[PDB]
Amino acid sequence: DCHLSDMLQQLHSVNASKPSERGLVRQEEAEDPACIPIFWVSKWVDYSDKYGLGYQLCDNSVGVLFNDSTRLILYNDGDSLQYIERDGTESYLTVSSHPNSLMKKITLLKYFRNYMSEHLLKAGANITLARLPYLRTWFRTRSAIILHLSNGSVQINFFQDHTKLILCPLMAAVTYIDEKRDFRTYRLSLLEEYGCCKELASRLRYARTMVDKLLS
């Protein structure tokens, strides 16, 4: 990742500068609505002991990262599919016509979509040209799930308190979703500048270490 390189810098820059420890924190002055992200994960399902990691993006498309490290996406038209092999090669197809070699996985995705159509909360449901990204990797920790999409974006959802970061290195920007499910986007360079709350500074410290694991 040219991107993830960028992201660790940005983030380290902001964390080095110790933004909570300021005479007068001015976090709202680092806000920047002209940087809101197009895609994040609104829901996810971890059936990774058997099948893989199911998930839905904010545009209502659905995806799976199977345990064999391939991915099938279903677009929000209900029919278009994109399959992505371990090497990254990508075929496109539909539900109506598609090799039989994909029967089992197309079905697995239908099940994942049926479940996610009915069930979980839709993160960032209150918000509004990019290529639909797919899930590159994920992993869990005691404290959170980390989701790394092909468009270069890392999303970290925290379990305890339901807070979330979407990091876009394209813009040097991060979106915080707090416990009240308020949704504020910030430029990291302005956060370094203007400071932020002790909450977000800890989330952002975690996020650095999380982006380290991702690089490995």
**Separation of alpha carbons 189 and 58, rounded Å:** 26
Q: Which of 69, 62, 70 is nearest to 119 (CA)?
A: 62
**Separation of alpha carbons 21 and 196, rounded Å:** 9
State which approach was used to obtain the coordinates.
Answer: X-ray
Contact 83, 91 (CB under 8 A): yes
Resolution in A: 2.7
Contact 165, 155 (CB under 8 A): yes
Contact 1, 148 (CB under 8 A): no
Q: Which of 190, 154, 147 is nearest to 170 (CA)?
A: 154
Contact 196, 184 (CB under 8 A): no
Contact 173, 35 (CB under 8 A): yes
**Separation of alpha carbons 153 and 168, rounded Å:** 5
Pairing of strands 71-74, 80-84: antiparallel
- The H or E element spanning position 174 is strand 173-177
- Which residues does a chain break follow in the chain (C to N more than 2.5 Å)? 128
Domain annotation for the chain: domains and CATH numbers: 1-42+133-216 (3.30.1120.30), 43-132 (3.30.1120.30)
Helices 198-215 and 2-16 cross at an angle (nearest 10°) of 150
Which DSSP symbol is given to 92? E
Q: In what order do the strands lie in the sheet with 173-177?
A: 135-140, 144-149, 153-158, 164-168, 173-177, 183-187
